[PDB]
Design a protein around this ligand. Structure first.
Ligand SMILES: COc1cccc(-c2nnc3n(Cc4ccccc4Cl)c(=O)c4ccccc4n23)c1O
Ligand SMILES: CC1(N)CCN(c2cnc(-c3cccc(Cl)c3Cl)c(N)n2)CC1
Length: 480
């Protein structure tokens, strides 16, 4: 669960919540300077507030580490004590949130939708006077169940009285209400309200811009991240620790890229994952370390990747984000058993193209051209104010990829390989649907993001990137 995340509370409410309803070791996380987060922890009778920053690359915890998601952060500290400080701060008891705002099925102030979009078991919860309504489709028909709110507790007119709409929903999801004549009121899935028809994007962007709707949709997607805590065991192995740019930002074992080139001990690891929406697949990876440059070229060669998308400068804010893993123009370099020639570099406004020739040493016939698209103008923090540059760049990448027969997955990387990486990949997936199926196609942005996030942790980091994806898709349809 992710009940420890409270979306609409202040620092004062948080302090009072932890003092009156918590104990020592009680904790909660909350949004702020908007775009930032706070981890509020009770310790020795008093509340400590810890800053969490995210400008688009990772969740940066003060006095702690950098993480892909808030759920990964909480899971880690609840399992590794003595790590948060210089007195140790323990995350023992999540203080649960009763607010239903970030639930997929909660539609506050709101049958047309269930008739049009719904299927058997599609449900929603709306506010009635102070009471709520549970509307379910079965088949086919729609049934409305009244939810009474009496002294901070919720009930369906008998039986148990719940502390939150969530507890009631979870209960009647496991134990369905049966109508007198036998209709089982199964709460299968929440009603889909995010899937839009591509041609109606401008309309959706207008409605999400109203007091904002983009924040509520993004935070509802963030609440689903607790379902994506897959094992990242291989990246924890002693011999793999120095192969990670950020020790706690790890690739899922079920999608990680396994290297078989193998110098005959532990030669099979790279912090990278296959992303499936081979030719229209991606590899989402981190910016190279000096000790992973050889592994990066073994991955590119093994996977038959012909295109690399680099979305960071080598150095940003005086910090190394990616080592230069390619030779200077006209130069030839050996990176272990791999040989790379930089044939030619071409400078465009927002990016540089580098034509590379990759081959395995001692095997001339293994040579293939690798096109490196280096996006150089992405700001240090936040996102571009206009998506035109990113779309023009992606259009170019897409055509290069399409022109190459049996090209392997597109390699995409930034610093941690989750924020800008996930943003470019999600835009590229969404735009590809519009290429294939046309302006009259269905697109579902959080659905696409959730699908990508089950393949690599925290793909798409911020609300700013989330709004950027909608803005990019809107701009691509406007130029069609
Ligand atoms: C079905 O799911 C799983 C099955 C097996 C292992 C994992 C697993 N993989 N990584 C972690 N890390 C993350 C982690 C660990 C050590 C060093 C750095 C990091 Cl960043 C935890 O802190 C953790 C804590 C509690 C439980 C599982 C955890 N876990 C998993 O999720
Ligand atoms: C008003 C409201 N409480 C906030 C917006 N809203 C929703 C609904 N569903 C998703 C969704 C869609 C597909 C996959 C995933 Cl994982 C998610 Cl979470 C979403 N992000 N927001 C409707 C309810």
């Amino acid at each position: 669960s992710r009940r420890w995340f409270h979306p609409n509370i202040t620092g004062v409410e948080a302090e009072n919540l932890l003092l009156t309803r918590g104990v020592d070791g009680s904790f909660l996380a909350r949004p702020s300077n908007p775009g930032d987060f706070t981890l509020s922890v009770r310790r020795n009778g008093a509340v400590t507030h810890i800053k969490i920053q995210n400008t688009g690359d990772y969740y940066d915890l003060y006095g702690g580490e950098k993480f892909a998601t808030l759920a990964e952060l909480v899971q880690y500290y609840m399992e590794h004590h003595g790590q948060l400080k210089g007195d140790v701060i323990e995350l023992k008891y999540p203080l649960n949130c009763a607010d239903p705002t970030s639930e997929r099925w909660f539609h506050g102030h709101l049958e047309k939708l269930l008739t049009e979009k719904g299927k058997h078991g599609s449900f929603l919860v709306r506010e009635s006077p102070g009471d709520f309504v549970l509307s379910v489709r079965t088949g086919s028909k729609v049934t409305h169940v009244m939810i009474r709110c009496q002294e901070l507790k919720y009930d369906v007119g008998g039986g148990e009285r719940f502390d939150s709409l969530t507890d009631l929903v979870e209960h009647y999801k496991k134990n369905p209400m049966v109508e007198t004549l036998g209709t089982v009121l199964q709460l299968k899935q929440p009603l889909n309200t995010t899937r839009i028809n591509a041609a109606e994007i401008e309309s959706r962007v207008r409605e999400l811009s109203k007091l904002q709707g983009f924040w509520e949709e993004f935070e509802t997607l963030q609440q689903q991240e607790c379902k994506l805590l897959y094992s990242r065991k291989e990246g924890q192995r002693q011999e793999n620790k120095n192969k990670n740019r950020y020790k706690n930002i790890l690739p899922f074992d079920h999608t990680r890229v396994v290297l078989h080139d193998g110098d005959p001990p532990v030669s099979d690891y790279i912090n990278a994952n296959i992303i499936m929406p081979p030719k229209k697949s991606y590899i989402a990876t981190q910016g190279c370390l000096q000790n992973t440059v050889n592994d990066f070229w073994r991955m590119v060669f093994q996977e038959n990747s012909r295109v690399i998308v680099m979305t960071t400068k080598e150095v940003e804010r005086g910090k190394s984000k990616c080592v230069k893993y390619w030779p200077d123009e006209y130069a030839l370099k050996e990176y272990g058993v791999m040989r790379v020639r930089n044939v030619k570099e071409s400078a465009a406004h927002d990016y540089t193209l580098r034509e590379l020739k990759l081959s395995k040493v001692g095997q001339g016939n293994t040579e293939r051209t690798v096109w490196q698209y280096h996006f150089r103008t992405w700001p240090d923090h936040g996102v571009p104010s206009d998506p035109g540059g990113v779309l023009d760049f992606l259009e170019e990448v897409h055509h290069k990829q399409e022109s190459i027969m049996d090209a392997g997955p597109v390699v995409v990387h930034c610093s941690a390989g989750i924020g800008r990486t996930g943003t470019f990949i999600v835009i590229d997936i969404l735009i590809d649907i519009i290429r294939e199926k046309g302006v009259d196609c269905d697109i579902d942005v959080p659905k696409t993001i959730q699908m990508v996030r089950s393949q690599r942790s925290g793909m798409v980091q911020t609300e700013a990137q989330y709004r950027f994806i909608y803005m990019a898709v809107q701009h691509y349809i406007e130029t069609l």
